[PDB]
Amino acid sequence: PKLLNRLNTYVGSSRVGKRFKLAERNSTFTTELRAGTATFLTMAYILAVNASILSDSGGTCSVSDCIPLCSNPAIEPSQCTGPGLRLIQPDVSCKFNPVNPGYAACVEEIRKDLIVATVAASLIGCVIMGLMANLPLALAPGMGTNAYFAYTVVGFHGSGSISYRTALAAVFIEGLIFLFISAIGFRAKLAKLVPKPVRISSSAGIGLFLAFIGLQNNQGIGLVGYSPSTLVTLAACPASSRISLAPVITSANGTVSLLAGGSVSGDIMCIHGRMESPTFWLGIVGFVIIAYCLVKNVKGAMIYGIVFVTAVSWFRNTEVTAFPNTSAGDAAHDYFKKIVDVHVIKHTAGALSFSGINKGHFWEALVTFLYVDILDTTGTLYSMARFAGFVDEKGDFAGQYFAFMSDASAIVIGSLLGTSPVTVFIESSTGIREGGRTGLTAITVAVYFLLAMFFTPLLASIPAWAVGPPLILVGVMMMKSVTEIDWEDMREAIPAFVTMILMPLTYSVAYGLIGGIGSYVVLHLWDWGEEGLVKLGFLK
Amino acid sequence: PKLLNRLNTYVGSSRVGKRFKLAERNSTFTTELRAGTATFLTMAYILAVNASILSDSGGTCSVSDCIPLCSNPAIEPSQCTGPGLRLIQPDVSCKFNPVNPGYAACVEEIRKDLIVATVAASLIGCVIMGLMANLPLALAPGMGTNAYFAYTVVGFHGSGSISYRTALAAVFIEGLIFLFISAIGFRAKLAKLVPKPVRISSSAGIGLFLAFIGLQNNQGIGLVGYSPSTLVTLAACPASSRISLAPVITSANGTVSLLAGGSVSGDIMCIHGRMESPTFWLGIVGFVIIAYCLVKNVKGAMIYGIVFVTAVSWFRNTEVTAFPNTSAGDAAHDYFKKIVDVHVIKHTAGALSFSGINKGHFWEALVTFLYVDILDTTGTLYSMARFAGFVDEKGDFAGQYFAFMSDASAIVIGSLLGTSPVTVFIESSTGIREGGRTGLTAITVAVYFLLAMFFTPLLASIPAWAVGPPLILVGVMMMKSVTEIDWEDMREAIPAFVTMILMPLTYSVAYGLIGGIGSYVVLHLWDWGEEGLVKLGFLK
Ligand SMILES: *[C@@H]1O[C@H](CO)[C@@H](O[C@@H]2O[C@H](CO)[C@@H](O)[C@H](O)[C@H]2NC(C)=O)[C@H](O)[C@H]1NC(C)=O
Ligand SMILES: C/C(=C\CNc1ncnc2[nH]cnc12)CO
């Protein structure tokens, strides 16, 4: 035969091959390696997107890491000694535009931390799933929950109601609760708790939310900016023609003056040059690359698009550069220069904080995480079992108990490492489509994630317009769930429509879920009361 | 038999009954009256929503109708004579927040004009369709095109690139072109020009656009406001806790000062009291009323919800009042006091302006109007013919030629009266579902619209939170078209997703269409080139 067949037979007939049930499942070693390679190539975009999104949250640092600034920018603080010259003490506004250099350096260190944390949490989840559940499933920080954690629970640069550490405690407790309810068989009852239209359309809502993030500026390619009249219009002007906003006080004659302490925004309003930003068009080229690769069923479509946009942005003196001619850009380029690095999580690891348990926002975030993970993981795991043909007549696929326990454990470990909940990835289907049936697929994906480390300098240099199209296309793939809604029935269409449309518009997964569930409950009050009376016998 | 049967027989056997083919279509007079009544009850929400949306556009008046204001609001301009006191000449900013009282009085006069114009254009379109095409179809200002005309082509208070008069010229020429292409049988070829995913998903995009309008403040119930970080968050704080924004200049230390001439926004940013606006909750109650009425198949659901919210808002000293204790509110209440009035269009009639033909924005608006009307009217008319069983094996329904000519004529007449394009309403199906088969249904709807006049004082008093839920639910009904998209196919899902998501996010129907069509063309370039080469024989 051949050396490849020799290896396959040897591993299949060895103790480790019997542990993973290779012979019992009709695939021994090279199919597992290929399935893991395919799954990793399909899910590798997470290595960029998750760290970018979570770093936008600001990480663990506060105003305590903002450096005092001199009155005039021409004078560095160490030379800020003279007449009429004073250092400005940092306040909360130092976190936002214009961002304090100390806080800007935070986000870079935290982005390195979160790259490593994404890789490590994915590796640990993959290994636990492959060993304890023996399934060809890859686990990684959840794409939908990433944006919710960063921009809703914590907020851009920590502008939300819950701090980053408190949100990590929320994710830790959510993983513990998910593990507990899975261990007692109580997960399916809570899965049936959510209304069907809300459950089905939450995926479409999260997809629209992610796509909207991909069309913003600090998160994606631009193309959506501020409008004084409509609140949103066509952006994609160059960064040099974008301006910030501040709250003002009007009057009955027309006088308008600044509001002290108002939260100034990013450069979101275009004064001219619409549809002329070079980074928007580079992001569009990356979008086209990813879309053709998806159409052609080219595994690694998103990775190829991100890599193209990033490689174009790695040149140093262009208008699409990831390393602008600044101190922050020079430092980012210096880190990028070392192609490989062994970064150690110094900020986000063990950064849990249980201060917010008494706050209602903590429990809103906790419940949203819990139910997103419940519904998502149930649907994905059973879809993957159907793909692998592990589902029997009764509907169980053997290692499901340990599959859900492994997912909950991965969530807890990721919370400890400093990342949003980690979940089983639907992209695992690719590895299942390639013949992966045992846990060796997950071990292969874990080894690929291990190789993803040592390349933090290369992954920390990914600009927003590279994250960009991956977000928009993840939204596109998530929209396919709308077809399962009865749009001719208003009792299902109205709650489903509310769930889809509130997530991007209120910009919050939790608000979309609350609005959809509340509209469902209100619209079914009449039917429920009628049926209750009929049960009591009042009505026939 | 009975007097009703006597009337039915008499009319069916009379000359007018034979003109409308009553006997030939198995319905004589009372079925036509009931079908017209049902169609009117279903489509009567337009009498509020269209005038509200088009008045938000600012109408025909400019800064020329802004009154000069004194330096201090305590002094009326006529008493603005003294030391250090000067009248302020009005500029463009007088149109926006804080809105000049003269310009505020414009919008009220123009809203009366546009109520009358909506009613008159609907009446004329209905009569032309009933007589020249002899179909049970009701025509009225198009719901989708209303918002596009007001908030994109013209802009809130005329902040767009095309003036109101130039946009009316665009609608006039669009109606002329539609009539021309219909008269030469060239309409179906242009209908096949648009890609299938774009054509199908434009309806979902317009629905999302209308729903987003219904969740804004000057247009709907609130619940979506400005966010410095995310550009959109949960609004629905009271108007007393909302503040405006102005562009500012940042620096490298933190200094931020106002930008002279910047376009200040409305009260869109909530400083506190989220989810506490009484008008938001009144709008939610109206939404619940409309949603139950839709669920219960109660004709006139939207009218009932609008009427409830409006009647609650007609009380004078509440936080949800349509007549605040101001000069504008006192005048609005004085007009509302006269329950009936015969208003004469004094501003928007014959207000066409052909100055912008050389502008590219004029032609963008013209083409968007033309293709929205083409696709919409084709789909709706053929759906209505299928409902009425007027479609034969070949696919023609007899009066289709004159149906499309009547629609184009109605568009031209509405442009002359000062309203966005008028279209055949899908709500006509209700009248078709009630047995309406001849043009007497359209004549009945026209008579009901005639009765709608004489109630302009009653219709000009409808607040935003009443328009509100009707917009959101129109979006809900429009979303049902997504199920016709192959979401597993990326060449159809990506263009469809772009079309749906760009309309609310860029806040423009034209941009959604352009983005969707461009993405479709780009994603099919490879296939088209491959097939062209195969035709040339280069490839097998
Ligand atoms: C419009 O009226 C306001 C008062 O409501 C004027 O406010 C001035 O600007 C600030 C705010 O009080 C103070 O420094 C001035 O003393 C205010 N003056 C007065 C007379 O209130 C504002 O100046 C007025 N606008 C114009 C153009 O005169
Ligand atoms: C509802 C949740 C998604 C959370 N994360 C993921 N859940 C399932 N599969 C994935 N592939 C990439 N990310 C994910 C669906 O968006």
Ligand SMILES: C/C(=C\CNc1ncnc2[nH]cnc12)CO
């Ligand atoms: C694509 C266009 C709609 C324009 N107006 C209308 N087009 C067709 N039926 C209707 N009923 C109410 N408004 C309309 C679909 O939103």
